[PDB]
Motif scaffolding. Structure first.
Motif, PDB file in Angstrom:
ATOM      1  N   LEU A  78      67.749 -25.280 -28.219  1.00 51.60           N
ATOM      2  CA  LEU A  78      66.982 -24.433 -27.323  1.00 51.60           C
ATOM      3  C   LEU A  78      67.837 -23.918 -26.154  1.00 51.60           C
ATOM      4  CD1 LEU A  78      63.529 -26.322 -26.960  1.00 51.60           C
ATOM      5  CD2 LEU A  78      63.855 -24.017 -27.928  1.00 51.60           C
ATOM      6  N   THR A  79      67.750 -22.616 -25.930  1.00 46.23           N
ATOM      7  CA  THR A  79      68.351 -21.979 -24.761  1.00 46.23           C
ATOM      8  C   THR A  79      67.351 -21.360 -23.812  1.00 46.23           C
ATOM      9  OG1 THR A  79      68.695 -19.811 -25.864  1.00 46.23           O
ATOM     10  CG2 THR A  79      70.407 -21.431 -26.182  1.00 46.23           C
ATOM     11  N   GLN A  80      66.167 -21.004 -24.299  1.00 43.31           N
ATOM     12  CA  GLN A  80      65.099 -20.480 -23.409  1.00 43.31           C
ATOM     13  C   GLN A  80      63.795 -21.116 -23.770  1.00 43.31           C
ATOM     14  OE1 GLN A  80      68.583 -17.642 -23.278  1.00 43.31           O
ATOM     15  NE2 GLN A  80      67.284 -18.045 -25.086  1.00 43.31           N
ATOM     16  N   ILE A  81      63.016 -21.491 -22.764  1.00 45.78           N
ATOM     17  CA  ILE A  81      61.659 -22.028 -22.969  1.00 45.78           C
ATOM     18  C   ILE A  81      60.716 -21.484 -21.982  1.00 45.78           C
ATOM     19  CG2 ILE A  81      62.369 -24.171 -24.186  1.00 45.78           C
ATOM     20  CD1 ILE A  81      61.964 -25.637 -21.527  1.00 45.78           C
ATOM     21  N   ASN A  82      59.506 -21.296 -22.424  1.00 47.33           N
ATOM     22  CA  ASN A  82      58.383 -20.958 -21.543  1.00 47.33           C
ATOM     23  C   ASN A  82      57.245 -21.899 -21.826  1.00 47.33           C
ATOM     24  OD1 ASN A  82      56.327 -19.803 -20.049  1.00 47.33           O
ATOM     25  ND2 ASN A  82      56.712 -17.703 -20.773  1.00 47.33           N
ATOM     26  N   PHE A  83      57.000 -22.826 -20.911  1.00 56.93           N
ATOM     27  CA  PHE A  83      55.847 -23.713 -20.955  1.00 56.93           C
ATOM     28  C   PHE A  83      54.947 -23.507 -19.758  1.00 56.93           C
ATOM     29  CE2 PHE A  83      58.776 -26.278 -23.721  1.00 56.93           C
ATOM     30  CZ  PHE A  83      57.971 -26.417 -24.802  1.00 56.93           C
ATOM     31  N   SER A  84      54.986 -22.310 -19.179  1.00 56.21           N
ATOM     32  CA  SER A  84      54.167 -22.028 -18.036  1.00 56.21           C
ATOM     33  C   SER A  84      52.692 -22.058 -18.380  1.00 56.21           C
ATOM     34  CB  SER A  84      54.535 -20.675 -17.442  1.00 56.21           C
ATOM     35  OG  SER A  84      54.258 -19.616 -18.328  1.00 56.21           O
ATOM     36  N   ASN A  85      51.875 -22.367 -17.382  1.00 56.78           N
ATOM     37  CA  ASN A  85      50.388 -22.389 -17.532  1.00 56.78           C
ATOM     38  C   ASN A  85      49.948 -23.362 -18.606  1.00 56.78           C
ATOM     39  OD1 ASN A  85      48.758 -20.731 -15.695  1.00 56.78           O
ATOM     40  ND2 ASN A  85      50.360 -19.227 -16.184  1.00 56.78           N
ATOM     41  N   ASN A  86      50.369 -24.585 -18.439  1.00 59.82           N
ATOM     42  CA  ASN A  86      49.948 -25.668 -19.284  1.00 59.82           C
ATOM     43  C   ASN A  86      49.496 -26.822 -18.368  1.00 59.82           C
ATOM     44  OD1 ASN A  86      52.289 -24.372 -21.611  1.00 59.82           O
ATOM     45  ND2 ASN A  86      50.159 -24.940 -22.215  1.00 59.82           N
ATOM     46  N   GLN A  87      49.462 -28.051 -18.889  1.00 58.67           N
ATOM     47  CA  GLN A  87      49.032 -29.212 -18.093  1.00 58.67           C
ATOM     48  C   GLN A  87      50.121 -30.287 -18.079  1.00 58.67           C
ATOM     49  OE1 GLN A  87      46.546 -27.874 -20.644  1.00 58.67           O
ATOM     50  NE2 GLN A  87      46.307 -26.373 -18.977  1.00 58.67           N
ATOM     51  N   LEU A  88      51.362 -29.849 -18.056  1.00 50.61           N
ATOM     52  CA  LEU A  88      52.514 -30.796 -18.081  1.00 50.61           C
ATOM     53  C   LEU A  88      52.661 -31.557 -16.819  1.00 50.61           C
ATOM     54  CD1 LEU A  88      55.209 -28.698 -19.801  1.00 50.61           C
ATOM     55  CD2 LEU A  88      53.505 -30.142 -20.948  1.00 50.61           C
ATOM     56  N   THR A  89      53.003 -32.817 -16.968  1.00 50.76           N
ATOM     57  CA  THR A  89      53.386 -33.646 -15.849  1.00 50.76           C
ATOM     58  C   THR A  89      54.810 -34.159 -16.109  1.00 50.76           C
ATOM     59  OG1 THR A  89      52.192 -35.532 -16.885  1.00 50.76           O
ATOM     60  CG2 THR A  89      50.957 -34.306 -15.299  1.00 50.76           C
ATOM     61  N   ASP A  90      54.996 -34.793 -17.213  1.00 52.88           N
ATOM     62  CA  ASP A  90      56.261 -35.375 -17.589  1.00 52.88           C
ATOM     63  C   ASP A  90      57.124 -34.344 -18.315  1.00 52.88           C
ATOM     64  OD1 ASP A  90      58.224 -37.205 -18.301  1.00 52.88           O
ATOM     65  OD2 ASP A  90      57.202 -38.060 -20.003  1.00 52.88           O
ATOM     66  N   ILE A  91      58.314 -34.098 -17.826  1.00 53.83           N
ATOM     67  CA  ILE A  91      59.251 -33.220 -18.549  1.00 53.83           C
ATOM     68  C   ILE A  91      60.514 -33.932 -19.032  1.00 53.83           C
ATOM     69  CG2 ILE A  91      58.379 -31.095 -17.526  1.00 53.83           C
ATOM     70  CD1 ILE A  91      60.847 -31.221 -15.580  1.00 53.83           C
ATOM     71  N   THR A  92      60.396 -35.241 -19.214  1.00 51.88           N
ATOM     72  CA  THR A  92      61.509 -36.064 -19.673  1.00 51.88           C
ATOM     73  C   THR A  92      62.164 -35.542 -20.977  1.00 51.88           C
ATOM     74  OG1 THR A  92      60.665 -38.010 -18.543  1.00 51.88           O
ATOM     75  CG2 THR A  92      62.221 -38.503 -20.289  1.00 51.88           C
ATOM     76  N   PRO A  93      61.376 -35.019 -21.955  1.00 50.23           N
ATOM     77  CA  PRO A  93      61.956 -34.438 -23.196  1.00 50.23           C
ATOM     78  C   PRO A  93      63.025 -33.347 -23.001  1.00 50.23           C
ATOM     79  CG  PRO A  93      59.645 -34.811 -23.523  1.00 50.23           C
ATOM     80  CD  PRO A  93      59.883 -34.974 -22.048  1.00 50.23           C
ATOM     81  N   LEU A  94      63.108 -32.752 -21.810  1.00 49.31           N
ATOM     82  CA  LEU A  94      64.137 -31.732 -21.552  1.00 49.31           C
ATOM     83  C   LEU A  94      65.490 -32.246 -21.198  1.00 49.31           C
ATOM     84  CD1 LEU A  94      62.076 -29.196 -19.278  1.00 49.31           C
ATOM     85  CD2 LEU A  94      62.329 -29.305 -21.811  1.00 49.31           C
ATOM     86  N   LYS A  95      65.573 -33.555 -20.920  1.00 50.36           N
ATOM     87  CA  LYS A  95      66.678 -34.157 -20.121  1.00 50.36           C
ATOM     88  C   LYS A  95      68.050 -33.913 -20.697  1.00 50.36           C
ATOM     89  CE  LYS A  95      68.747 -38.790 -18.957  1.00 50.36           C
ATOM     90  NZ  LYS A  95      69.260 -38.416 -17.649  1.00 50.36           N
ATOM     91  N   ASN A  96      68.106 -33.807 -22.054  1.00 48.10           N
ATOM     92  CA  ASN A  96      69.391 -33.642 -22.797  1.00 48.10           C
ATOM     93  C   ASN A  96      69.602 -32.264 -23.431  1.00 48.10           C
ATOM     94  OD1 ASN A  96      70.075 -36.344 -22.280  1.00 48.10           O
ATOM     95  ND2 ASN A  96      69.076 -37.037 -24.196  1.00 48.10           N
ATOM     96  N   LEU A  97      68.615 -31.341 -23.230  1.00 50.47           N
ATOM     97  CA  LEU A  97      68.628 -29.991 -23.766  1.00 50.47           C
ATOM     98  C   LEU A  97      69.555 -29.152 -22.919  1.00 50.47           C
ATOM     99  CD1 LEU A  97      64.945 -29.466 -24.811  1.00 50.47           C
ATOM    100  CD2 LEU A  97      66.802 -30.288 -26.264  1.00 50.47           C
TER     101      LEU A  97
END
Ligand SMILES: [Ca+2]
Length: 462
Positions: free
Chosen positions: A67-86
């Motif tokens: 992954l080089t671009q992501i859009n997770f705007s307008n959701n109910q995220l709290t934890d973003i730990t899955p991004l840590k190594n991307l």
């Protein structure tokens, strides 16, 4: 630095969030969330547009290593730990979640764009090594300390909020072209004098009274200081490239510093202490001028502003609205809460779409009849007091209230048991009374704009 699956695995066992699994099924070209995918399948995902999907967890995204671009705007995220190594991530759109902890972003050093506004972020220390950032958007968070921004020297666009008092961490960010510090607690903008490449500065809803730091920011074309504590705007004389200026909700009275800013096309001065607009007379490129909530009586200087399409004048002490008759292009004219008792001068402003003139002394709508391009209209709550008259057990005055058709509007109520026989309003007052009154209330439409034309009329008795 990469999460992988060793055997083909159902999508719903990788992406445990229902909504995300459903999205990934489409992305991965499968026909059911129970379908298996391989790591090869996952490796082909380089961008993910997953905005407004009701996603509560991005568990599984760690397997999308490319992954080089992501859009997770307008959701109910709290934890973003899955991004840590991307670490191939270049751009993240993640506004409008419930993220507080951005520690997982700390090593995403290939980020050039990061959008995190409308979250619950206080601590931005995790951003400090993201030095390739050119866009950083942090408005509507709970950030009180911007020290972590001090090394983001490639930033061209920046916004943040909503606790900041100390802007000194911005000093070396001279690449900044657009800064928005709206809704913070800033009074001291001295550091901004260093940001000489700024083209747009939005600094609304702060505590700024001293704008002398802006003096050398001559590349500014857009400036907003709406909602501060400004009075002296002398410094603005230096900002001759300004085309859009918003100084509303301040304490300004002296507009002379604006007189040479002839590239202004929009000028917003609502809610100040202005009693004189002569310094604006030369600003002939203006199309939008706001002068509501001031101390204006005479408005004759607007006469030269021939390109005005929009004009606000509500909440002043204007008796003579007629200078607006010079404005052929006028589309929106708001002057509610003034002392206007004659609208004859509006009769030829054929381009008016919006006319809002409640709380004046208007008794006669007939001059408005050919304003048939109106789509919004306001004529509520006129109020006025007639010249005094001599008491009299039996007292009578004529009705002057005219609808747009020219018809007299019958009174709605009459004080002191008074009565009406067109056109006369007649009272029988047992003993001396200091005043009598009546009201009118008439729905009316002109063009497609509808309102109630109404008022209360007071008759003093001598
Ligand atoms: Ca414009």
């Amino acid at each position: 630095g990469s999460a992988t699956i060793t055997q083909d695995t159902p999508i719903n066992q990788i992406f445990t969030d229902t909504a995300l699994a459903e999205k990934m099924k489409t992305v991965l070209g499968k026909t059911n969330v129970t379908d298996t995918v391989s790591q090869t399948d996952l490796d082909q995902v380089t961008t993910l547009q997953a905005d407004r999907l009701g996603i509560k967890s991005i568990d599984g995204v760690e397997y999308l290593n490319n992954l080089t671009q992501i859009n997770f705007s307008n959701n109910q995220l709290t934890d973003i730990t899955p991004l840590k190594n991307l670490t191939k991530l270049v751009d993240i759109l993640m506004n409008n979640n419930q993220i507080a902890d951005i520690t997982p972003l700390a090593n995403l050093t290939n980020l050039t764009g990061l959008t995190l506004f409308n979250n619950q972020i206080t601590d931005i220390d995790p951003l400090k090594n993201l030095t390739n950032l050119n866009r950083l958007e942090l408005s509507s968070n709970t950030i009180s300390d911007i020290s972590a921004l001090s090394g983001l020297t490639s930033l061209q666009q920046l916004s943040f909020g909503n606790q900041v008092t100390d802007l000194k961490p911005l000093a070396n960010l001279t690449t900044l072209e657009r800064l928005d510090i709206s809704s913070n607690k800033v009074s001291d903008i001295s550091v901004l004098a260093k940001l000489t490449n700024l083209e747009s500065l939005i600094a609304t809803n702060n505590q700024i009274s001293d704008i002398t730091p802006l003096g050398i920011l001559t590349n500014l074309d857009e400036l907003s200081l709406n909602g501060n504590q400004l009075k002296d705007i002398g410094t603005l004389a230096s900002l001759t490239n300004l085309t859009d200026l918003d100084l509303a909700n301040n304490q300004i009275s002296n507009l002379a510093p604006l007189s040479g800013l002839t590239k202004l096309t929009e000028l917003k001065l609502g809610a100040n202490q202005i009693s004189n607009i002569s310094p604006l007379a030369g600003l002939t490129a203006l199309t939008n001028l706001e002068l509501n909530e001031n101390q204006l009586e005479d408005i004759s200087p607007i006469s030269n502003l021939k390109n005005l399409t929009y004009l606000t004048l509500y909440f002043n002490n204007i008796s003579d609205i007629s200078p607006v008759s010079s404005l052929t292009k006028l589309q929106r004219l708001f002057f509610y809460n003034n002392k206007v008792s004659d609208v004859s001068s509006l009769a030829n402003l054929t381009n008016i779409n919006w006319l809002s003139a409640g709380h004046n002394q208007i008794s006669d709508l007939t001059p408005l009849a050919n304003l048939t391009r109106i789509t919004q209209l306001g004529l509520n709550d006129q109020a006025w007091t007639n010249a005094p008259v001599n008491y009299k057990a039996n007292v009578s005055i004529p009705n002057t209230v005219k609808n747009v058709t020219g018809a007299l509007i019958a009174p709605a109520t009459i004080s002191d048991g008074g009565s009406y026989t067109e056109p006369d309003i007649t009272w029988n007052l047992p003993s001396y009374t200091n005043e009598v009154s009546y009201t009118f209330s008439q729905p009316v439409t002109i063009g497609k704009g509808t309102t109630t034309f109404s008022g209360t009329v007071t008759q003093p008795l001598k």
